Amino acid sequence: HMSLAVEAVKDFLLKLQDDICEALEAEDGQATFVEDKWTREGGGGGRTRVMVDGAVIEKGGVNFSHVYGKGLPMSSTERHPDIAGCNFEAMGVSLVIHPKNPHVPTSHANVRLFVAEREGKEPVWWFGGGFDLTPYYAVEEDCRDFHQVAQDLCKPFGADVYARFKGWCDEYFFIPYRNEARGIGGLFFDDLNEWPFEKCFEFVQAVGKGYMDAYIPIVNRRKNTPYTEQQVEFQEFRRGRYAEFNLVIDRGTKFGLQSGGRTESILISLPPRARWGYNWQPEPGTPEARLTEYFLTKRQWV
Amino acid sequence: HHHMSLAVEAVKDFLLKLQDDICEALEAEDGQATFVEDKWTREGGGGGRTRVMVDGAVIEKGGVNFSHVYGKGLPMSSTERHPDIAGCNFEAMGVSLVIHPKNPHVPTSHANVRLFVAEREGKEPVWWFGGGFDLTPYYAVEEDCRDFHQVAQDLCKPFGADVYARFKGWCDEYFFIPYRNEARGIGGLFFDDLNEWPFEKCFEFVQAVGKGYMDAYIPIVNRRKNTPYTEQQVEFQEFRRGRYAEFNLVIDRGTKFGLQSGGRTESILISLPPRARWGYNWQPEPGTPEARLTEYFLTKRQWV
Ligand SMILES: O=C(O)c1cc2cc(F)ccc2[nH]1
Ligand SMILES: O=C(O)c1cc2cc(F)ccc2[nH]1
Incomplete structure (x- = not known):
């Protein structure tokens, strides 16, 4: 029973969203995020904040979602068969920022947590997420700085953490039929639960x-x-x-x-x-x- | 086989002409731009001719393609609906088109006709036809939707009383976006796995x-x-x-x-x-x- 660990996570995600929006609003100075709070049939919901037609951000979304459900949905039983009928909680922030100016890259980030409540067993859970940069007219110094931030934030968690998740980002954000990466990478991870x-x-x-x-x-x-x-x-x-x-x-x-x-x-x-x-x-x-x-x-x- | 090989070729020839004919008609309506052809050759067997039109008087982006591909054993993601014929020599051919008009009052449209054949040793070959056509309007007119469908209902009639109903119904189920609970266009014809008839x-x-x-x-x-x-x-x-x-x-x-x-x-x-x-x-x-x-x-x- 992780209810309080999960609440701590929830409280953080809601704050992260406020923090990203405020910061992005401060950069735009013309438009602000408009919020759309929603709910689903027995499944919690989310708070979608969107920005459109700003001075800097032409289209931007920073979402919070928290999904409840009885039994994992049909698509997840192919990837997660062992916990297909379980009560589950999924919560996260997702964002994609599409600037007006081509010289500002598109960017994406995600932090999320999946918790599956088991009959008899302690609950199964994992985090996931990352961020990445999708330049149009790239700048060397920017790419380097972007990645340096990723490596620096990874340093306290293990020596191989950046390498692993940087590489994972390169493998994931790739268009195989076009043999082409989507952006210049960043961090990507999933099924994170090897650590406490x-x-x-x-x-x-x-x-x-x-x-x-x-x-x-x-x-x-x-x-x-x-x-x-x-x-x-x-x-x-x-x-x-x-x-x-x-x-x-x-x-x-x-x-x-x-x-x-x-x-x-x-x-x-x-x-x-x-x-x-x-x-x-x-x-x-x-x-x-x-x-x-x-x-x-x-x-x-x- | 012999009869199938001879028939498969009559199908190719139909497809090559179908494309010229469709392109000609479409060029006739534009008046200004004409299709550019890009021939290509698959590394493994066969190839095709992709014909496109851009920045026309009427057709802003148009694509009318022909393919004839053939190989030893199917590709990897064909061992899922057809595992029993994954090692066979295959032939797949077809014409596929999407037309996107400059004018919003002219609907986008799509059509497709294809044949797949899998030659099997000693056993009869497996084969089927597939495709159909459909209309994706932006500013739809009633008369055009009725007409478009009557033309489909009319071409089906001689083939059987229930043919239009099946393939018009199939068109609505297929070209549908479930997550938006929303049809793609006003419909037409769609069919796959067509080998029920000789x-x-x-x-x-x-x-x-x-x-x-x-x-x-x-x-x-x-x-x-x-x-x-x-x-x-x-x-x-x-x-x-x-x-x-x-x-x-x-x-x-x-x-x-x-x-x-x-x-x-x-x-x-x-x-x-x-x-x-x-x-x-x-x-x-x-x-x-x-x-x-x-x-x-x-x-x-x-x-x-
Ligand atoms: O794998 C998932 O379930 C998942 C991936 C993902 C990426 C995002 F940007 C936001 C939510 C997500 N959920
Ligand atoms: O199912 C197929 O293999 C197939 C579907 C399809 C649809 C088109 F519009 C064109 C070619 C196709 N091939």
Whole structure:
């Protein structure tokens, strides 16, 4: 019976959300998050905060969800058969930020906790999450700083923690049919429970704080970079690739929509505008081609 | 076999001509842009011709593809619905198209005709046909929906009293976004695993279906292409094309199977719109012609 450990987690997630929103509002200075609190048939709910048409953030969502349920949904019994009929609690923050300026990267973060209550056995549980950076017109110094924040926050938890979860981020956020990474990586983890519960929780706190320390400065630094409408077009074609990942490959997006999740809360990840063209490529040799030729394939920043 | 090999080739030839014919008709309606052909050759066996059209007077993004692929043993994600024929030599061919008009008052449309054949040693071959056609309007007109369906009902009739009912029903169940509780378009025809009839009969049906597409769709384009439209209308169109992307990337099996089994990405994804939009809790204004698409047309389902 972890009810109080779970409440501590809940209290943190709600605070992280406030903390990310406030910070992002402070960067925009024009628009604020509008909140949409929701509920489901015997399944808790969430508080979806969205920002649209700001000075800096064109489309942005920072969601809190807390899902109850009797028996895991149908899709999870393929991955988690051993606890398919269990009472479960799932709670987390998910965010995707799509800046107006192409020179500010898109970014994503997640912290979450799954707890399954067992008949006779102590409860099964794991954390999960990460953050990652999806530049359009990348900047070396930004990528390095991003990753450095990730490695630094990992340092207190073990010597191999960054390596493992950085690599996991590279493997996960990849479009195999296009042989192409989605962004320049960051951290990614799941089924985190090898450490005692308190050490894992502290880790996800560090990942939550880590996001704001990694991303906010990059937004402050590049938001006022001047951009042409040609660069917006490139950005819109790149967002096609983002839509693909989220709709074709992403496991949480897929599981969110299969199992009865709130569509509009799940799909805050989709960009404001996206373009697709037959055989679309950026002109090789340009800043536009450099993203895929250099930035997406480096996979070694720190 | 001999008879099947001879028949398979009659099917190819039909498909190659179907494509020229569809492209010609579509070029005839545009007047301005013409299809560009991109021939490609699978490393393993076969290939295809992808024909696309961009920035037309009428067709903003158009894709009419032909494939004929063939190999030793099926791909890895075909050991799940067809494990018993995963080591067989196979042939899969077909024509697949998606048309996205510049004008919002011209519906997007899609059509597909294909054949899969798996040659088996000593046992008769396994084979089936599949495909159909469907209409995805933005600003739907009643008369066009009825007509589109009558053309489908008419081509089916000679094949049997219940054929239109099955494949029109199937179209509604298939092209549907469950998580949004929302149809994709106003329907049409859809069928898969078609081998219930002798080969020759199934084949003639897909030929009817293929001809049906031009008969159903080209008049509608000709009728609507010069309808005046606003930037506000194009904006609704692009939000609606978010739903279209959604279906193809999240739900469509053909896209799933193609992308995960080593098919040619840009060819598979001609289906995707030139521009799309998403907004959190975006819905058309109630009481507007925009809202009428989802409130009426998409839930109507009964046209003929
Ligand atoms: O695997 C999951 O269940 C899951 C992945 C994921 C990613 C997000 F960004 C948000 C919620 C999620 N849930
Ligand atoms: O099920 C398939 O293999 C398949 C479905 C499909 C749909 C299209 F529009 C085009 C080709 C296809 N192949």
